[PDB]
Amino acid sequence: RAFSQIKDAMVFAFNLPAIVELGTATGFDFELIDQAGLGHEKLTQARNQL
Protein backbone atom coordinates (compact mmCIF):
# COMPACT_ATOMS: atom_id res chain seq x y z
CA ARG A 1 0.00 0.00 0.00
CA ALA A 2 2.63 2.45 1.28
CA PHE A 3 4.22 2.01 -2.17
CA SER A 4 1.02 2.88 -3.95
CA GLN A 5 1.13 6.73 -3.59
CA ILE A 6 4.35 6.54 -5.86
CA LYS A 7 5.04 8.42 -9.15
CA ASP A 8 4.77 6.58 -12.46
CA ALA A 9 6.49 3.53 -10.91
CA MET A 10 4.27 0.42 -10.25
CA VAL A 11 5.98 -0.94 -7.10
CA PHE A 12 4.54 -4.18 -5.71
CA ALA A 13 5.56 -6.37 -2.76
CA PHE A 14 4.73 -9.98 -2.10
CA ASN A 15 5.59 -13.09 -0.22
CA LEU A 16 7.25 -15.94 -2.20
CA PRO A 17 5.33 -19.27 -2.35
CA ALA A 18 6.20 -22.52 -0.45
CA ILE A 19 8.26 -24.18 -3.10
CA VAL A 20 9.89 -21.22 -4.97
CA GLU A 21 10.74 -23.41 -8.01
CA LEU A 22 7.27 -25.07 -8.51
CA GLY A 23 3.65 -24.58 -9.80
CA THR A 24 2.54 -21.25 -8.23
CA ALA A 25 -1.13 -19.97 -7.71
CA THR A 26 -4.12 -22.09 -8.40
CA GLY A 27 -4.16 -19.67 -11.42
CA PHE A 28 -3.88 -20.62 -15.06
CA ASP A 29 -1.11 -20.19 -17.64
CA PHE A 30 -2.42 -19.71 -21.14
CA GLU A 31 -0.42 -19.25 -24.35
CA LEU A 32 -1.86 -17.76 -27.53
CA ILE A 33 -0.09 -19.32 -30.59
CA ASP A 34 0.67 -17.59 -34.01
CA GLN A 35 -0.43 -20.69 -35.80
CA ALA A 36 0.23 -19.18 -39.43
CA GLY A 37 1.36 -16.20 -41.37
CA LEU A 38 -0.23 -13.60 -38.95
CA GLY A 39 2.57 -11.28 -37.87
CA HIS A 40 3.43 -9.90 -34.37
CA GLU A 41 0.62 -7.40 -35.10
CA LYS A 42 -2.06 -9.71 -35.98
CA LEU A 43 -1.28 -11.67 -32.97
CA THR A 44 -1.55 -8.57 -30.96
CA GLN A 45 -4.91 -7.57 -32.17
CA ALA A 46 -5.67 -11.22 -31.59
CA ARG A 47 -4.35 -11.11 -27.97
CA ASN A 48 -6.13 -7.92 -27.34
CA GLN A 49 -9.44 -9.32 -28.58
CA LEU A 50 -9.43 -12.09 -26.05
Next chain:
Amino acid sequence: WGGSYVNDFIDRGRVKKVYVMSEAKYRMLPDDIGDWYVRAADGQMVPFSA
Protein backbone atom coordinates in the same frame (compact mmCIF):
# COMPACT_ATOMS: atom_id res chain seq x y z
CA TRP B 1 26.37 -25.49 -61.82
CA GLY B 2 26.55 -26.46 -58.15
CA GLY B 3 24.22 -24.44 -55.99
CA SER B 4 25.48 -22.08 -53.23
CA TYR B 5 23.53 -20.88 -50.36
CA VAL B 6 24.59 -17.40 -49.35
CA ASN B 7 22.57 -16.83 -46.20
CA ASP B 8 19.08 -16.62 -44.65
CA PHE B 9 16.08 -14.51 -45.75
CA ILE B 10 12.77 -14.70 -43.85
CA ASP B 11 9.52 -16.09 -45.09
CA ARG B 12 6.33 -15.04 -43.37
CA GLY B 13 8.24 -15.38 -39.92
CA ARG B 14 10.06 -18.54 -40.41
CA VAL B 15 13.73 -18.22 -41.05
CA LYS B 16 14.51 -19.94 -44.49
CA LYS B 17 17.63 -20.68 -46.72
CA VAL B 18 18.85 -18.46 -49.78
CA TYR B 19 20.70 -20.07 -52.81
CA VAL B 20 22.35 -18.58 -55.91
CA MET B 21 22.58 -20.95 -58.96
CA SER B 22 22.09 -21.21 -62.64
CA GLU B 23 18.71 -21.13 -64.20
CA ALA B 24 18.27 -24.67 -65.34
CA LYS B 25 18.46 -23.88 -69.07
CA TYR B 26 22.16 -22.61 -68.71
CA ARG B 27 23.48 -25.82 -67.19
CA MET B 28 22.51 -28.92 -69.17
CA LEU B 29 25.33 -29.96 -71.45
CA PRO B 30 29.05 -29.33 -71.51
CA ASP B 31 28.74 -26.70 -74.22
CA ASP B 32 27.01 -24.33 -71.72
CA ILE B 33 30.16 -24.13 -69.66
CA GLY B 34 30.60 -21.81 -72.60
CA ASP B 35 28.53 -18.99 -71.22
CA TRP B 36 30.28 -18.16 -68.08
CA TYR B 37 33.01 -15.50 -68.36
CA VAL B 38 34.73 -14.14 -65.30
CA ARG B 39 36.05 -10.60 -64.63
CA ALA B 40 39.72 -10.42 -64.36
CA ALA B 41 41.68 -7.80 -62.65
CA ASP B 42 41.79 -5.67 -65.88
CA GLY B 43 37.96 -5.73 -65.98
CA GLN B 44 38.21 -7.60 -69.32
CA MET B 45 35.51 -10.37 -69.27
CA VAL B 46 37.44 -13.70 -69.73
CA PRO B 47 35.82 -17.01 -70.55
CA PHE B 48 36.67 -20.38 -69.18
CA SER B 49 37.89 -21.66 -72.54
CA ALA B 50 40.86 -19.52 -71.95
